[PDB]
Design a protein around this ligand. Structure first.
Ligand SMILES: CCCCCCCCCCO[C@@H]1O[C@H](CO)[C@@H](O[C@H]2O[C@H](CO)[C@@H](O)[C@H](O)[C@H]2O)[C@H](O)[C@H]1O
Ligand SMILES: CCCCCCCCCCO[C@@H]1O[C@H](CO)[C@@H](O[C@H]2O[C@H](CO)[C@@H](O)[C@H](O)[C@H]2O)[C@H](O)[C@H]1O
Ligand SMILES: CCCCCCCCOCCOCCOCCOCCO
Ligand SMILES: CCCCCCCCOCCOCCOCCOCCO
Ligand SMILES: CCCCCCCCOCCOCCOCCOCCO
Ligand SMILES: CCCCCCCCOCCOCCOCCOCCO
Ligand SMILES: CCCCCCCCOCCOCCOCCOCCO
Ligand SMILES: CCCCCCCCOCCOCCOCCOCCO
Ligand SMILES: [Mg+2]
Ligand SMILES: [Mg+2]
Ligand SMILES: [Mg+2]
Length: 435
């Protein structure tokens, strides 16, 4: 029951990074952009259900700075921002702290479930937290249902409503606003569904809104089949967004519907190497000039579901842009190094356009330009196989990112693109169980 089925788990985390970026307004100096060493640690209590109907979850984490270079930018998203509320953010520093990231009543009744309080989305909608080591947190509620039809498939759906949020690098919640940071968005809500036909074919879709401002869409089809005894997995994904401000004010983001479509393939070869081939295509006409999967435009103010992630620094999400990604991860078990893996990946993207109009354009703004970007990354991972520290993981990731233009960072009507970088991340993740 509620006591007997309780669990208490957590982890200790270590992160060290060095990233530099080209300033094409001072020669082309690769200047320090991030340089810090930071710890996290968390405790997560999840109760059982009294009478199979009522429970409680409570979880908290701390972040402790260890080193930071004076030229490191802020916030680094592993420590806490010195600005506790997202809409106060002024980019001037980072700090240590303790955050309550889960605190919720949970309910079950037949096929129905619900959660309320300080929560993460967990069902079928398109709301989502940001993830660092730990997730961001919404103030609100979600309810959903699950119906199993045996071999004929299974249906799930849910609805969530929220009026405040905090990213994992913010110690306090803030409300929602339009692009101007002052016109109120009273709530975000979303409804979605999933149908699993139990033949490896699965459909998902969802709709969301930011009150008075943005309508958001999500749809995904996936399928897998065996090729030579091993599954090839495929998916088609659609993300869309439309706004309700088209007067050419600061709050006017998109002309028409903006969207991102994607195709993915995955396959494990010779039972030893995981291969990925993926591509994306974006349309984002209007003042902003890039696609967002979240329903509020300001950095850190909320997040939305996005199943595409290439860990190659850029978002590759500019108006018109096409991108293709290839990744390989090689399991070294047959060299008798079980738990050891090495990888490499590459991206090439073309046809990236800027915003279609600008109110105070800069020297470099050219409505009809197109640009390109590319990147490649290397990866090394080791997970402890047995003993006291079984499952503790060490990871090293290197990216080299190349902007194929001379436009300075964030300039030219390309408001989400920055300049060439080199990035190195080292992390350690050490989970534990108390009971
Ligand atoms: C356990 O009691 C906690 O002690 C924390 C440690 O003193 C307090 O964190 C308070 O102080 C921390 C450190 O200044 C902040 O990071 C927190 O956001 C702030 O709630 C917190 O309220 C309080 O429940
Ligand atoms: C086990 C318990 C460990 C608790 C650690 C500190 O928890 C913090 O306490 C703050 C104070 O209660 C919360 O601020 C909450 O309450 C403040 C009002 O006092 C608001 O300004 C914030 O927006 C709102 O997030 C904050 O989220 C939460 O992390
Ligand atoms: C900003 O940090 C300034 C230096 O402060 C020293 C950090 O203290 C050591 C942190 O390491 C403790 C790991 O648990
Ligand atoms: C128990 O472990 C809690 C460790 O947390 C240390 C708190 O971090 C310092 C926060 O103070 C910084 C605000 O000035
Ligand atoms: C847990 C909340 O997430 C709901 C389902 O999320 C989608 C999982 O698939 C995304 C990666 O392909
Ligand atoms: C299972 O629970 C599903 C309940 O969903 C309720 C739908 O939410 C109402 C949305 O209406 C908002 C009005 O704009
Ligand atoms: C201009 C709309 C484009 C939508 C693209 C297709 C996305 C497929 O999934 C969307 C599922 O959403 C269902 C719509 O929900 C109701 C919308 O109407 C509500 C008020 O306008
Ligand atoms: C310094 C230039 C580096 C550019 C290298 C790009 C690397 C891209 O590769 C990723 C492998 C697939 O075959 C194995 C299956 O058999
Ligand atoms: Mg295989
Ligand atoms: Mg081999
Ligand atoms: Mg370059």
């Amino acid at each position: 029951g509620f006591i007997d089925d309780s669990t208490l788990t957590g982890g200790i985390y270590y992160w060290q990074r060095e990233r530099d970026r080209k300033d094409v307004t001072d020669g082309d100096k690769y200047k320090t952009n991030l340089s810090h060493s930071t710890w996290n640690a968390n405790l997560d209590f999840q109760s059982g259900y009294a009478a199979d109907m009522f429970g409680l979850d409570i979880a908290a984490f701390t972040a402790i700075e260890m080193a930071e270079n004076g030229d490191s930018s802020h916030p680094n998203e592993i420590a806490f921002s010195k600005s506790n509320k997202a809409y106060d953010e002024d980019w001037s520093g980072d700090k240590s702290g303790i955050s309550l990231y889960k605190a919720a009543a949970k309910f079950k009744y037949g096929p129905v479930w619900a959660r309320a309080g300080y929560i993460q989305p967990t069902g079928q909608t398109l709301l989502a937290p940001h993830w660092s080591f730990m997730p961001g947190t919404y103030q609100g509620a979600e309810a959903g249902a699950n119906f199993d039809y045996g071999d004929a498939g299974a249906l799930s759906f849910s609805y969530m409503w929220t009026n405040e949020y905090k990213a994992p690098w913010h110690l306090e919640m803030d409300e929602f606003y339009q692009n101007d940071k002052t016109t109120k968005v009273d709530y975000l809500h979303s409804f979605g569904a999933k149908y699993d036909f139990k033949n490896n074919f699965v459909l998902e879709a969802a709709f969301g809104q930011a009150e008075g401002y943005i309508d958001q869409y999500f749809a995904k089809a996936s399928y897998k089949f065996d090729i030579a005894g091993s599954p090839l997995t495929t998916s088609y994904q659609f993300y869309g967004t439309r706004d309700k401000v088209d007067d050419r004010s600061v709050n006017d983001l998109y002309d028409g519907t903006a969207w991102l479509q994607a195709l993915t393939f995955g396959y494990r070869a010779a039972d030893v190497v995981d291969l990925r081939l993926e591509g994306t295509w974006v349309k984002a006409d209007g003042q902003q000039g890039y696609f967002l999967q979240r329903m509020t435009p300001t950095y850190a103010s909320s997040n939305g579901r996005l199943d595409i992630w290439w860990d190659n620094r850029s978002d590759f999400n500019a108006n018109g842009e096409k991108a293709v990604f290839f990744g390989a991860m090689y399991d070294l078990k047959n060299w008798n190094l079980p738990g050891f893996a090495i990888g490499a990946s590459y991206v090439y993207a073309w046809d990236a356009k800027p915003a279609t109009w600008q109110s105070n354009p800069d020297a470099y703004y050219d409505k009809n330009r197109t640009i390109e970007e590319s990147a490649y990354s290397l990866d090394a991972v080791y997970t402890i196989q047995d003993g006291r520290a079984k499952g503790t993981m060490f990871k090293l990731h290197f990216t080299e990112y190349d902007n194929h233009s001379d436009i300075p960072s964030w300039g030219g009507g390309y408001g989400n693109i920055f300049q060439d970088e080199r990035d190195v991340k080292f992390m350690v993740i050490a989970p534990f169980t108390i009971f």
